[PDB]
Amino acid sequence: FFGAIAGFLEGGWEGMIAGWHGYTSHGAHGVAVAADLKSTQEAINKITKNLNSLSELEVKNLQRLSGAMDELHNEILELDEKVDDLRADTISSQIELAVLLSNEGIINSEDEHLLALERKLKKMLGPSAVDIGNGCFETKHKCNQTCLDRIAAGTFNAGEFSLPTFDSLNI
Amino acid sequence: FFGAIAGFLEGGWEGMIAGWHGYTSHGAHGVAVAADLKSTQEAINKITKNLNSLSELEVKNLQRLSGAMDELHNEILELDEKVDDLRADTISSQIELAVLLSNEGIINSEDEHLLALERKLKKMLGPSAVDIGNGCFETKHKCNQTCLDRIAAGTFNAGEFSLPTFDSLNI
Amino acid sequence: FFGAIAGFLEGGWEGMIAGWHGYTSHGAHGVAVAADLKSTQEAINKITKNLNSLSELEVKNLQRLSGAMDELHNEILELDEKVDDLRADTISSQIELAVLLSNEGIINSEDEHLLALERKLKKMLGPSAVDIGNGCFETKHKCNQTCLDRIAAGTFNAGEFSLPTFDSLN
Amino acid sequence: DRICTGITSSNSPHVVKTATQGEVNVTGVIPLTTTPTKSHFANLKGTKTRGKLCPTCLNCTDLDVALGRPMCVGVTPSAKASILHEVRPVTSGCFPIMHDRTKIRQLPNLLRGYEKIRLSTQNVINAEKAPGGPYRLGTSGSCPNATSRSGFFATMAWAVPKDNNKTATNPLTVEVPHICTKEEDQITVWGFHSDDKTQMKNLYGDSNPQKFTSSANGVTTHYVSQIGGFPDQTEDGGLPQSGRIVVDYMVQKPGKTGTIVYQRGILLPQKVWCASGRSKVIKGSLPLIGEADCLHEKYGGLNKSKPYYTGEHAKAIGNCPIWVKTPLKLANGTKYRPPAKLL
Amino acid sequence: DRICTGITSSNSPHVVKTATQGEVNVTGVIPLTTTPTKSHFANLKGTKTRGKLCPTCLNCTDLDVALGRPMCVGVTPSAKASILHEVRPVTSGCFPIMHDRTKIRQLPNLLRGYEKIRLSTQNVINAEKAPGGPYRLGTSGSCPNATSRSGFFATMAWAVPKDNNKTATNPLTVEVPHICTKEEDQITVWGFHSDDKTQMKNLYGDSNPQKFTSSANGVTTHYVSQIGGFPDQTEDGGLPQSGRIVVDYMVQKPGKTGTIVYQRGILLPQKVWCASGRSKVIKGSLPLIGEADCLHEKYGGLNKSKPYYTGEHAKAIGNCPIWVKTPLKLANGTKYRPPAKLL
Amino acid sequence: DRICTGITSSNSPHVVKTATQGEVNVTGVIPLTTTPTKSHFANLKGTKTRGKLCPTCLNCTDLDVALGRPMCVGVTPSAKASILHEVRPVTSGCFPIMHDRTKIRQLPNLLRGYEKIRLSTQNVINAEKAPGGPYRLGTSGSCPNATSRSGFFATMAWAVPKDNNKTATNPLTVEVPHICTKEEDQITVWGFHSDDKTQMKNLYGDSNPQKFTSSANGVTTHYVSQIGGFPDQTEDGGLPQSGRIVVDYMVQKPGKTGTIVYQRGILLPQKVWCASGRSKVIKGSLPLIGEADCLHEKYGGLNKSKPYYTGEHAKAIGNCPIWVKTPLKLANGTKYRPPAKLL
Numbered sequence A, B: 001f002f003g004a005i006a007g008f009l010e011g012g013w014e015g016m017i018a019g020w021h022g023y024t025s026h027g028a029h030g031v032a033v034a035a036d037l038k039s040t041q042e043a044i045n046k047i048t049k050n051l052n053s054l055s056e057l058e059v060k061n062l063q064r065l066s067g068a069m070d071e072l073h074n075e076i077l078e079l080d081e082k083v084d085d086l087r088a089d090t091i092s093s094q095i096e097l098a099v100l101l102s103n104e105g106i107i108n109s110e111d112e113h114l115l116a117l118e119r120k121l122k123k124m125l126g127p128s129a130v131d132i133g134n135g136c137f138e139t140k141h142k143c144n145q146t147c148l149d150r151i152a153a154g155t156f157n158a159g160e161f162s163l164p165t166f167d168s169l170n171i
Numbered sequence C: 001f002f003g004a005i006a007g008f009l010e011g012g013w014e015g016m017i018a019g020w021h022g023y024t025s026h027g028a029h030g031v032a033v034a035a036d037l038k039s040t041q042e043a044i045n046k047i048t049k050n051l052n053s054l055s056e057l058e059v060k061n062l063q064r065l066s067g068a069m070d071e072l073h074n075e076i077l078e079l080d081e082k083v084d085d086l087r088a089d090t091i092s093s094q095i096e097l098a099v100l101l102s103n104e105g106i107i108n109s110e111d112e113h114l115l116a117l118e119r120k121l122k123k124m125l126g127p128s129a130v131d132i133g134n135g136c137f138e139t140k141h142k143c144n145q146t147c148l149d150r151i152a153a154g155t156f157n158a159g160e161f162s163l164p165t166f167d168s169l170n
Numbered sequence D, E, F: 001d002r003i004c005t006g007i008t009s010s011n012s013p014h015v016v017k018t019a020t021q022g023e024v025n026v027t028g029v030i031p032l033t034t035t036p037t038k039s040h041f042a043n044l045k046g047t048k049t050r051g052k053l054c055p056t057c058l059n060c061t062d063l064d065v066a067l068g069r070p071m072c073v074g075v076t077p078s079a080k081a082s083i084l085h086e087v088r089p090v091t092s093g094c095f096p097i098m099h100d101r102t103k104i105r106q107l108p109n110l111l112r113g114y115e116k117i118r119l120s121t122q123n124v125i126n127a128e129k130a131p132g133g134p135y136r137l138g139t140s141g142s143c144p145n146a147t148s149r150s151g152f153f154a155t156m157a158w159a160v161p162k163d164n165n166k167t168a169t170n171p172l173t174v175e176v177p178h179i180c181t182k183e184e185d186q187i188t189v190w191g192f193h194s195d196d197k198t199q200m201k202n203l204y205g206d207s208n209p210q211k212f213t214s215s216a217n218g219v220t221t222h223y224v225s226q227i228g229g230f231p232d233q234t235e236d237g238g239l240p241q242s243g244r245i246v247v248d249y250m251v252q253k254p255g256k257t258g259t260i261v262y263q264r265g266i267l268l269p270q271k272v273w274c275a276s277g278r279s280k281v282i283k284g285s286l287p288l289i290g291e292a293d294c295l296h297e298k299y300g301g302l303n304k305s306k307p308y309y310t311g312e313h314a315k316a317i318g319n320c321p322i323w324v325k326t327p328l329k330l331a332n333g334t335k336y337r338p339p340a341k342l343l
């Protein structure tokens, strides 16, 4: 919903194959596409943790009453049957809710992955680039597939095009 | 909570009538207000889908035991009464939880709608505008009601004020 | 996860004592640390409201059946025992779920607190500062502990360094 | 000039609960609940709905039908949903019964919990040739037909010794076989007649209390009769009688034989009930008026609008709203904001 | 210079579970649970709490009160919550009872499940004029009053044939009417006396075992007596006796008459119990000490601090914490961050 | 040049539900459910699993074992989980029983619900010296040992009057004491023998029906016998017999004495069952093949892969998947995006 309002591109790139989100370069070379492996691995890890959490739910067994005999205690066994059915129904609903929220969470974070990728791109591109606001940056230089690939790996240096760069704090 | 820390305006505009969120323009004309219909429709649709999801829950009926007769099986009918009551209580709680999370989601999504509107505004206003950080942009030109209205419709052009613009990719 | 992708600093500052999140200044003075009390109070309040919401859940008592006597009605009392156990189990699960989502919300909101602190800092630093994108700004001026302290209180003025500032609407 | 993002301010009287902000005021809501009002009961949409067991049998009550009273024997339609309108079903004719001395009143309520109910076409026991000398099958003007002044319940046979010099007897045993299908339960109706000292002597050749015991599916019941000094006749044919009957039922699961041990005055089973499946049963009232999506014990017939409802929870069947403790609302607007002004 | 946003780093020994990050270490938590400690039981805050049925009746036990023992008849206060302290209520006086031959011990436990319990002021049956010749109402020194050396349970009448040449009898039937209000259940106490052969001859004119059957609300019970060779007296008045009684109870719902069929040695019902409403009942230990918010079967009386609790789940009433499987915590700090350094 | 953040586009046939976007198409999912297939039953991993009560006792059925039939008495191992394979347990030898006249068939199903079951080593009653004259302990060629042509059920003693000039008797009472530990329930087996008129005269000195009543833990049961005209022998030793027995059981909780009131033909209790704990019991079939994580009533034995399962819900024990109404999926990819192109 965020990208829709912010004018982020609503389509996707079939070339982005080694991952789920990443970068595109435009201009005159045509179009290059690169998957960012950090963001993709992060998404996969969140989903994996979510899976562990959903797989961790443990519930009590439903078995027969030990004292209630067939024929002799049919009314009790009917109430017992009702209890089993209602437990199964209710826990089913609750599970459907946990999974629904999990999936809502998964689908919602996409645009946030984009926002983070924009911050990573912003720092790497340096202060000579211009921020458009729709997830796109205007550069003074050319960026063919080899440049985008250097962006995805975080090895990109604007110095290689004789442009100013931000340095990184030694931590 | 985001706006409170980020210094976003905590008040609202009574003039904003065709929608829930949008833009204000300040300076010398005084103050103009325009509702953004895209953001409003997006919010309404999210809420409507949420409504559908809450209305989709189906639970088993509670009726009498067919075999347990009044007078004769009062103890069983008492346990049955306890079962009905506990089912109603628990499912009621679970529904209250689903609704609580839904409402939490909506109220929480307000500031995200604002952040997205800032990205849309950033691209439309062009690179001559200055980003303040509190959701406000400083312009070189005047923007009366007719201009703000042009911002709301995404038809705004900085060229009309002889100012640089970001172009749009042919997609 | 946001900071991990965006290259935000993954470490923390032990000096930040009056709060949970805030600001650091780098350069030549070395390193100054200041806690932001607004963001911290906001987080504390969210958690407190969350606590109230979790403490508001009310459930029915489980007591004995009034009509079912021991010995005479053991099968019924067994089914009754089963009912109590399944209720405790199910409500326990539902509560664990509410608390899980609460904690998920808090941990997830940390980076959002950071993003908000970046907008507050951006406006206070004025248009002469340069946004790096990893939550850091490059300034033309020095910022020792007393400056950072002025940033944390929102009393910071770039005018004091003869630098342009953003004004505030009346 | 300066240009900013913003949110509206309007009257915000609606309140909703959140997890991180507590209760917040909002400009609009979508109510998720209603409180229904008490309406008459109705038919279940998509489910044929049972009221009286045999609706074609007029002036007859459900107990009358369940006992097989003369003039009151007809078709009893299948139904997957049923209304329980009599917590204590009464009779309206035939021979005076001392109802509260057994569980007999509950017989029709037991039947309605099955989907399909039919009265057997053949007798489960040959009463004339049953143990204890040959019997004539007693009859009474209290139970008049449409083509006869006298008769008796179709489900039982008033076994009275045929010969002169009739005497007291030891407890005798009949096996009651299961004559329904393998998919059907059999409900066997039986009982005993008693009277005053003189009439007892006349009819059975003994004026002492007689004893009766039934055994089926692990349940044993034991009864000893009363001679004279009966409580007043009620719920009967209106004709004065000196005696009374006591009536009971045995449930026999498929392939399960039951036994009755009896002395003088036995009302032997004849036509038995064959019943299968389950009907969803709730309390309600009669007549059924119109259609509705949902039947609720405290509100009657109702259609579903909102997904949830507030009010009194009770048993309810069909396409129903889900009960909740509180009138929940889903936010459809923004949180309250004070109007912003220039100077 | 460079200025950045950051988050603190502090000791983070606390762990919480998340959905997308698994377990994470945090600087602080708000515990949501405690494990309670075993304390004595107490009164329920905001709810009058029943212990003994008749607290004004000293040296008397709950069964004694329920049977209407002499000296042990007093006020039985209403209460919406009750503690069950005797799973097998014993007697402490009056005539020797063979308790385990019926369900009688559970009578006081049945009474406490009602809110209001009162003993009727009038007798439900006139024993002197009851069927089977006129009776004298038997008495015993085992059941002494404060103004008499002899007596008997107020709820029953030891009906013994008055006349000379008393003989054996056929089984006789009494109807037991419902004499409580339309809002009340009636609990009718009845039974039978037996003795050795000679005394049986003396008292009743028959030395053979006598038979008894009760019928109420669809439940039939049958008993046959014992002549001599009784088990030793216990839980009684301390006086040696040659005979024993067997005592039982019938529950009659409002407007439901019950019947008893009896021979010689009958203990006919007199004062009956009138009982209405429901009390929340849990297992407990006496004396009640102080007040508490919540009563718990495994922990006793307790007040509520945290919203949840861990430990042993059991039945519990009042303003109680909700049981959870694990000590849940609400994160109240930040996720762990390693300390950042310059070089 | 222009550089932008973006998201992939791939085939997206998988669908998941969301709260704010409805159903959305995605590039990948992790299925959370499976539908199991019907397999044979098995042993519960980590829990010893009971099938037949006494597995060492060959050619014997569970009812045979429960009654203590000769040649079929051996060790009955403890087990915390059990399979119910006979809803109507049959016998395969010894003396002809009229099974459907009591609840006796369910006896072995009751035993398997306990964790530990053992047959007592001492007799609970001395039958030879029991009330009603001295008895010889009857025997029959229908119930052969391996070292004898004749015998009888170990749980009962066929008490038949020893002396000449044997006569009819009044109803006599025996107390059946609790001889198990304070931690054990006692299951007492008893019954009665009947025959045709002449043999009844021969054996007991009375040709009239005999009466029997048991009372334990508040439950009374009453039976009256049948003389001749028995239904055909079935599930017995194969030897023609003129008489039949009826067999029943009493459950006595620890410290609870039970009583039996009997006349002629009594089968007095001898060895009783001592049983403690609980076993988790579900319906299933035999033989148990292999090990499995989970036992499920409709699918048999199964191992757990996915956390949830779809299909038919039924009772299930062990490390089991949780039933859900619908085949849930966890999104493991991105939302569908149409391919973006240049011109």
Ligand SMILES: *[C@@H]1O[C@H](CO)[C@@H](O[C@@H]2O[C@H](CO)[C@@H](O)[C@H](O)[C@H]2NC(C)=O)[C@H](O)[C@H]1NC(C)=O
Binding pocket: D011, D012, D013, D014, D015, D025, D336
């Ligand atoms: C916040 O919500 C409350 C409750 O809806 C609004 O206050 C109510 O207004 C009525 C008007 O007669 C008064 O009884 C009280 O002022 C409130 N009612 C109760 C029961 O407290 C309040 O106006 C809302 N705040 C706004 C709109 O700013």
Ligand SMILES: *[C@@H]1O[C@H](CO)[C@@H](O[C@@H]2O[C@H](CO)[C@@H](O)[C@H](O)[C@H]2NC(C)=O)[C@H](O)[C@H]1NC(C)=O
Binding pocket: D039, D290, D291, D292, D293, D301, D302, D303
């Ligand atoms: C529930 O809905 C039904 C269906 O709309 C209502 O009955 C219909 O409306 C009128 C009677 O008011 C008739 O002309 C229609 O023919 C009825 N339809 C059917 C199928 O019977 C009914 O009144 C509603 N009940 C409520 C609102 O309580």
Ligand SMILES: *[C@@H]1O[C@H](CO)[C@@H](O[C@@H]2O[C@H](CO)[C@@H](O)[C@H](O)[C@H]2NC(C)=O)[C@H](O)[C@H]1NC(C)=O
Binding pocket: B018, B019, B040, B044, D028, D030, D332, D333
């Ligand atoms: C939620 O609120 C919106 C407006 O706040 C409602 O939509 C408006 O009212 C009708 C219904 O569609 C339309 O004619 C208007 O044009 C809508 N205004 C808009 C879209 O800005 C909407 O119906 C509400 N949702 C409900 C009641 O479920």
Ligand SMILES: *[C@@H]1O[C@H](CO)[C@@H](O[C@@H]2O[C@H](CO)[C@@H](O)[C@H](O)[C@H]2NC(C)=O)[C@H](O)[C@H]1NC(C)=O
Binding pocket: E012, E013, E014, E015, E025, E336
């Ligand atoms: C993270 O959490 C764990 C558990 O609270 C902490 O490890 C425990 O504390 C010390 C190790 O520092 C040991 O004495 C305990 O046995 C540990 N317990 C477990 C279960 O591992 C740890 O200190 C916490 N903090 C960090 C930074 O890891």
Ligand SMILES: *[C@@H]1O[C@H](CO)[C@@H](O[C@@H]2O[C@H](CO)[C@@H](O)[C@H](O)[C@H]2NC(C)=O)[C@H](O)[C@H]1NC(C)=O
Binding pocket: E039, E290, E291, E292, E293, E301, E302, E303
């Ligand atoms: C539960 O709380 C009550 C109320 O505080 C405690 O009882 C009170 O405190 C002291 C007991 O030492 C007395 O002076 C008060 O008069 C008591 N008030 C009453 C009884 O109403 C009680 O001890 C607490 N129980 C616990 C903690 O188990």
Ligand SMILES: *[C@@H]1O[C@H](CO)[C@@H](O[C@@H]2O[C@H](CO)[C@@H](O)[C@H](O)[C@H]2NC(C)=O)[C@H](O)[C@H]1NC(C)=O
Binding pocket: C017, C018, C019, C044, E028, E030, E332, E333
């Ligand atoms: C949640 O944690 C914070 C810790 O930061 C608690 O707030 C502390 O308590 C004092 C109150 O005297 C506050 O002024 C400070 O912000 C905190 N103290 C320190 C030393 O940082 C807060 O109370 C906690 N919430 C609870 C326990 O419910």
Ligand SMILES: *[C@@H]1O[C@H](CO)[C@@H](O[C@@H]2O[C@H](CO)[C@@H](O)[C@H](O)[C@H]2NC(C)=O)[C@H](O)[C@H]1NC(C)=O
Binding pocket: F011, F012, F013, F014, F015, F025, F336
């Ligand atoms: C969205 O998901 C649905 C459900 O899988 C897809 O609909 C199927 O499309 C295929 C081919 O287009 C048909 O053969 C099926 O009959 C459709 N319905 C089903 C499977 O229920 C749809 O293609 C997806 N949309 C995409 C991939 O863009």
Ligand SMILES: *[C@@H]1O[C@H](CO)[C@@H](O[C@@H]2O[C@H](CO)[C@@H](O)[C@H](O)[C@H]2NC(C)=O)[C@H](O)[C@H]1NC(C)=O
Binding pocket: F039, F290, F291, F292, F293, F301, F302, F303
């Ligand atoms: C469930 O899992 C067990 C354990 O793997 C399976 O049995 C094992 O695998 C083969 C099958 O006979 C044997 O060689 C192993 O010795 C078995 N191990 C044990 C401990 O029994 C079993 O087949 C599985 N059942 C299913 C999948 O239905």
Ligand SMILES: *[C@@H]1O[C@H](CO)[C@@H](O[C@@H]2O[C@H](CO)[C@@H](O)[C@H](O)[C@H]2NC(C)=O)[C@H](O)[C@H]1NC(C)=O
Binding pocket: A044, F028, F030, F332, F333
């Ligand atoms: C979720 O999906 C991802 C990819 O969409 C799965 O990861 C795969 O496993 C390989 C391991 O060699 C990784 O390198 C790639 O990311 C993926 N490649 C292939 C060919 O699948 C991940 O396993 C999925 N999670 C599950 C199935 O739980």
Ligand SMILES: *[C@@H]1O[C@H](CO)[C@@H](O)[C@H](O)[C@H]1NC(C)=O
Binding pocket: A144, A145, A146, A147
């Ligand atoms: C991109 O351009 C540079 C500069 O000419 C060149 O060295 C490199 O090989 C190019 N990459 C591709 C993929 O064409």
Ligand SMILES: *[C@@H]1O[C@H](CO)[C@@H](O)[C@H](O)[C@H]1NC(C)=O
Binding pocket: B144, B145, B146, B147
């Ligand atoms: C805004 O100013 C321009 C100046 O030319 C004018 O054309 C336009 O009509 C103005 N709009 C309003 C609402 O005054």
Ligand SMILES: *[C@@H]1O[C@H](CO)[C@@H](O)[C@H](O)[C@H]1NC(C)=O
Binding pocket: C144, C145, C146, C147
């Ligand atoms: C920071 O620098 C200013 C400018 O000289 C000075 O007045 C102030 O005392 C300094 N503060 C610290 C903590 O050094």
Ligand SMILES: *[C@@H]1O[C@H](CO)[C@@H](O)[C@H](O)[C@H]1NC(C)=O
Binding pocket: D058, D059
């Ligand atoms: C039912 O009774 C009424 C009056 O009692 C009568 O008009 C009607 O014909 C009767 N219907 C019968 C007997 O079927």
Ligand SMILES: *[C@@H]1O[C@H](CO)[C@@H](O)[C@H](O)[C@H]1NC(C)=O
Binding pocket: D070, D071, D145, D146, D147, D148, D150, D151, D152
């Ligand atoms: C009337 O009752 C007699 C039994 O006395 C029966 O044979 C006859 O078929 C009945 N007639 C009708 C129409 O029910």
Ligand SMILES: *[C@@H]1O[C@H](CO)[C@@H](O)[C@H](O)[C@H]1NC(C)=O
Binding pocket: D164, D165, D166, D167
């Ligand atoms: C006739 O009556 C006598 C005395 O009541 C009885 O003993 C005899 O068996 C009877 N004969 C019959 C019923 O054939």
Ligand SMILES: *[C@@H]1O[C@H](CO)[C@@H](O)[C@H](O)[C@H]1NC(C)=O
Binding pocket: E058, E059
């Ligand atoms: C009755 O109570 C008094 C005072 O508690 C006591 O002294 C006396 O022994 C009691 N009588 C009994 C227990 O018989």
